[PDB]
Amino acid sequence: RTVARDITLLECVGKGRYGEVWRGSWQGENVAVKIFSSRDEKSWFRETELYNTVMLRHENILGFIASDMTSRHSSTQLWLITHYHEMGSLYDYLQLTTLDTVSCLRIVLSIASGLAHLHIEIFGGKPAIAHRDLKSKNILVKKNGQCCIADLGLAVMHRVGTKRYMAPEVLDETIQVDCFDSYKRVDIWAFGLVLWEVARRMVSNGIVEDYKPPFYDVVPNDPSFEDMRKVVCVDQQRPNIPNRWFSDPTLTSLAKLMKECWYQNPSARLTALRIKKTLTKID
Amino acid sequence: DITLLECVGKGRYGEVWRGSWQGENVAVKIFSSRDEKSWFRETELYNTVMLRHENILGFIASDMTSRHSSTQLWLITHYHEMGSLYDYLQLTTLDTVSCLRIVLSIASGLAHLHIEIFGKPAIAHRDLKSKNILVKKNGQCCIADLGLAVMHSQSTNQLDVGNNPRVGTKRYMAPEVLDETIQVDCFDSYKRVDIWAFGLVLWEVARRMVSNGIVEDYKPPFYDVVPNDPSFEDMRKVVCVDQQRPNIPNRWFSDPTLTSLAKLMKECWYQNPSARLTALRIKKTLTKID
Ligand SMILES: COc1cc(-c2cncc(-c3ccc(C4CCN(C)CC4)cc3)c2C)cc(OC)c1OC
Numbered sequence: 001r002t003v004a005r006d007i008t009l010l011e012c013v014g015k016g017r018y019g020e021v022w023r024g025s026w027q028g029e030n031v032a033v034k035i036f037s038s039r040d041e042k043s044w045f046r047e048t049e050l051y052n053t054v055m056l057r058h059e060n061i062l063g064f065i066a067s068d069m070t071s072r073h074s075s076t077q078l079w080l081i082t083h084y085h086e087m088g089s090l091y092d093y094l095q096l097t098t099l100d101t102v103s104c105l106r107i108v109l110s111i112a113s114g115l116a117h118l119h120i121e122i123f124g125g126k127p128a129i130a131h132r133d134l135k136s137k138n139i140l141v142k143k144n145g146q147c148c149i150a151d152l153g154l155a156v157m158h159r160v161g162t163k164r165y166m167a168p169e170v171l172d173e174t175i176q177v178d179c180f181d182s183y184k185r186v187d188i189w190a191f192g193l194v195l196w197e198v199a200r201r202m203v204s205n206g207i208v209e210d211y212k213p214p215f216y217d218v219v220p221n222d223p224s225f226e227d228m229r230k231v232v233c234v235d236q237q238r239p240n241i242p243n244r245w246f247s248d249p250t251l252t253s254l255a256k257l258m259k260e261c262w263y264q265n266p267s268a269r270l271t272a273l274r275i276k277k278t279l280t281k282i283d
Numbered sequence: 284d285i286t287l288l289e290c291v292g293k294g295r296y297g298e299v300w301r302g303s304w305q306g307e308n309v310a311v312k313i314f315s316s317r318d319e320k321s322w323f324r325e326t327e328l329y330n331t332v333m334l335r336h337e338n339i340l341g342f343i344a345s346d347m348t349s350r351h352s353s354t355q356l357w358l359i360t361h362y363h364e365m366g367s368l369y370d371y372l373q374l375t376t377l378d379t380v381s382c383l384r385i386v387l388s389i390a391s392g393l394a395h396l397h398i399e400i401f402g403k404p405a406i407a408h409r410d411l412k413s414k415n416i417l418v419k420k421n422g423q424c425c426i427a428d429l430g431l432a433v434m435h436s437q438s439t440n441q442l443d444v445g446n447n448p449r450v451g452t453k454r455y456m457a458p459e460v461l462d463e464t465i466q467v468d469c470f471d472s473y474k475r476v477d478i479w480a481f482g483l484v485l486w487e488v489a490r491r492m493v494s495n496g497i498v499e500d501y502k503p504p505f506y507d508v509v510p511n512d513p514s515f516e517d518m519r520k521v522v523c524v525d526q527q528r529p530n531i532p533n534r535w536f537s538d539p540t541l542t543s544l545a546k547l548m549k550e551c552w553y554q555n556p557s558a559r560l561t562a563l564r565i566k567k568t569l570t571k572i573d
């Protein structure tokens with residue numbers, strides 16, 4: 001039989017130290033192609049090993065298509081091929097777009113749904129999975145208004161995370177590394193920061209905050225590990241909740257939720273399943 | 284496009300196809316889902332650019348593909364029309380020059396695997412056998428199937444045994460594998476398992492080398508002493524309980540080449556793994572034999 005393999009790379013939609021992401025075409029259909037730098041080969045191996053263990057299929061997880069390794073003269077080429085989401089990342093989307101109550105809740109409940117799917121072991125099924133690098137650049141926006149979680153290069157089944165989004169126990173090196181639940185609680189911290197990023201862009205009484213990343217007012221760009229440790233661990237700062245949120249029932253409820261993702265004590269933080277339940281009871 | 288033209292092998296592992304790609308023959312292995320951990324391990328091994336060697340099966344691509352709940356696992360390599368050494372020996376006899384060319388090429392490949400390049404880690408194969416050796420039109424061979432391989436880095440003191448429940452082909456398993464006393468955290472243990480298996484492949488090849496008008500029929504190791512399709516315990520009985528080793532046909536002792544080869548394969552078969560020759564010593568010995 002014929003195995004029509006070739007993907008046409010059409011345009012570069014992201015370039016970094018990780019490598020590059022391209023919009024590509026296969027059999028007349030868009031795919032996303034992540035081409036790994038030599039620097040980040042282990043992310044390709046980890047995500048490939050995970051998908052070789054469990055073929056995740058969930059509306060709020062970026063859809064896997066293929067992992068490809070191709071021999072070159074003097075190098076190995078590593079590609080990850082996934083579904084393509086033309087609206088791009090949540091980070092991208094929040095820069096210019098404002099939200100209403102329905103679109104804000106649909107975004108954050110979709111992320112909570114993807115995260116709970118990763119976290120919960122299913123028997124017969126899937127291992128429990130922690131993401132370890134959850135942030136708004138690792139979430140894509142779909143045309144139907146839901147999001148999906150991307151990049152399982154650091155995922156653990158039962159490179160370090162982005163420093164801006166690191167939980168206090170990672171920064172002060174107290175994390176219980178032998179306890180899988182520790183990794184879930186690190187993702188919940190990061191989820192709370194994403195929930196804050198999104199909620200700022202929800203309009204209430206004609207007011208909205210500009211897009212800012214978590215801790216924009218207390219750390220530099222490309223904050224150091226020490227910069228973050230002083231803010232999060234030593235001074236125990238948390239992102240600001242604007243007064244205008246307390247006039248809006250949705251943002252009042254979202255502020256309570258994000259506070260319950262940011263407890264210093266990791267075992268006090270909400271679970272992804274409890275976050276989903278709380279979000280279904282808002283509005 | 285890759286075109287799959289004919290199935291050249293099918294078993295519990297999966298299947299291998301002869302295909303065409305960019306106007307050249309290629310081999311396309313499609314793994315069974317039961318053996319997904321071998322696919323991943325083989326892919327980790329082929330990531331190493333300095334693995335490439337005339338006596339190691341050359342890699343083109345590795346793929347995992349999926350839609351919905353089904354996954355395909357592909358390895359694409361160079362294609363060897365002459366097939367495996369196991370196939371080749373069934374029907375062909377050898378002269379001195381051909382016999383030594385085959386076994387020196389396998390020793391060359393195995394020494395390349397075992398010796399670290401400072402890169403390419405040291406590598407132990409763990410399933411060396413005549414079906415896992417391919418015959419090339421130049422009369423040399425190449426070693427195939429790195430799904431069970433173990434890697435070691437001397438500089439960093441790192442041992443990577445991988446995650447694969449697969450075990451070696453029962454017929455070729457060393458005594459310490461069959462009695463399960465092998466030291467699992469010791470890289471040298473895995474090299475010594477490969478040396479045992481190499482000795483068995485030497486014996487399979489040497490049987491097919493003519494001397495004084497005499498040759499033996501092709502037989503797999505231990506053909507005379509175990510059932511068809513021998514179990515793990517069948518092999519443990521003959522190797523560990525009965526202390527059996529392949530018999531040396533007495534006609535070999537009339538031929539200097541086969542006399543030298545019998546000496547070499549016996550030095551691969553010591554029950555004490557640390558007594559066995561290294562791959563490099565075997566290569567050096569075969570380089571000197573004529
Ligand atoms: C190797 O590489 C790539 C391959 C492909 C690709 C192209 N056509 C068809 C296929 C296909 C899928 C599934 C089967 C099944 C049919 C049922 N049967 C019982 C088992 C086998 C056969 C064929 C694939 C996987 C795409 C790629 O990228 C888009 C590849 O590159 C990563």
Ligand SMILES: COc1cc(-c2cncc(-c3ccc(C4CCN(C)CC4)cc3)c2C)cc(OC)c1OC
Pocket residue numbers: 013014021032033034080081082083084085086087088089092137138139140150151152
């Ligand atoms: C986070 O990580 C990964 C993401 C993706 C991915 C999937 N769909 C779409 C995208 C994308 C498309 C388009 C734009 C721009 C282009 C035009 N205009 C400026 C608006 C938007 C940005 C982004 C990406 C980057 C794939 C990945 O792997 C293959 C990723 O890695 C796991």
Ligand SMILES: COc1cc(-c2cncc(-c3ccc(C4CCN(C)CC4)cc3)c2C)cc(OC)c1OC
Pocket residue numbers: 026065066348349350353
């Ligand atoms: C990798 O990705 C894509 C792959 C394909 C594709 C191409 N040829 C064949 C297939 C296929 C056919 C049949 C089975 C069998 C499996 C067992 N049993 C007997 C029932 C069904 C499996 C697989 C597919 C899935 C299409 C895609 O898009 C339309 C893909 O997505 C980009």
Ligand SMILES: COc1cc(-c2cncc(-c3ccc(C4CCN(C)CC4)cc3)c2C)cc(OC)c1OC
Pocket residue numbers: 291292299310311312340358359360361362363364365366367370414415416417427428429
């Ligand atoms: C061992 O392992 C792998 C081997 C191969 C491979 C490469 N070239 C040629 C072959 C071959 C061709 C033809 C026959 C003939 C001989 C017997 N009779 C006349 C019918 C069949 C046998 C063997 C193979 C099997 C590819 C692999 O991966 C793509 C292997 O896995 C790593």
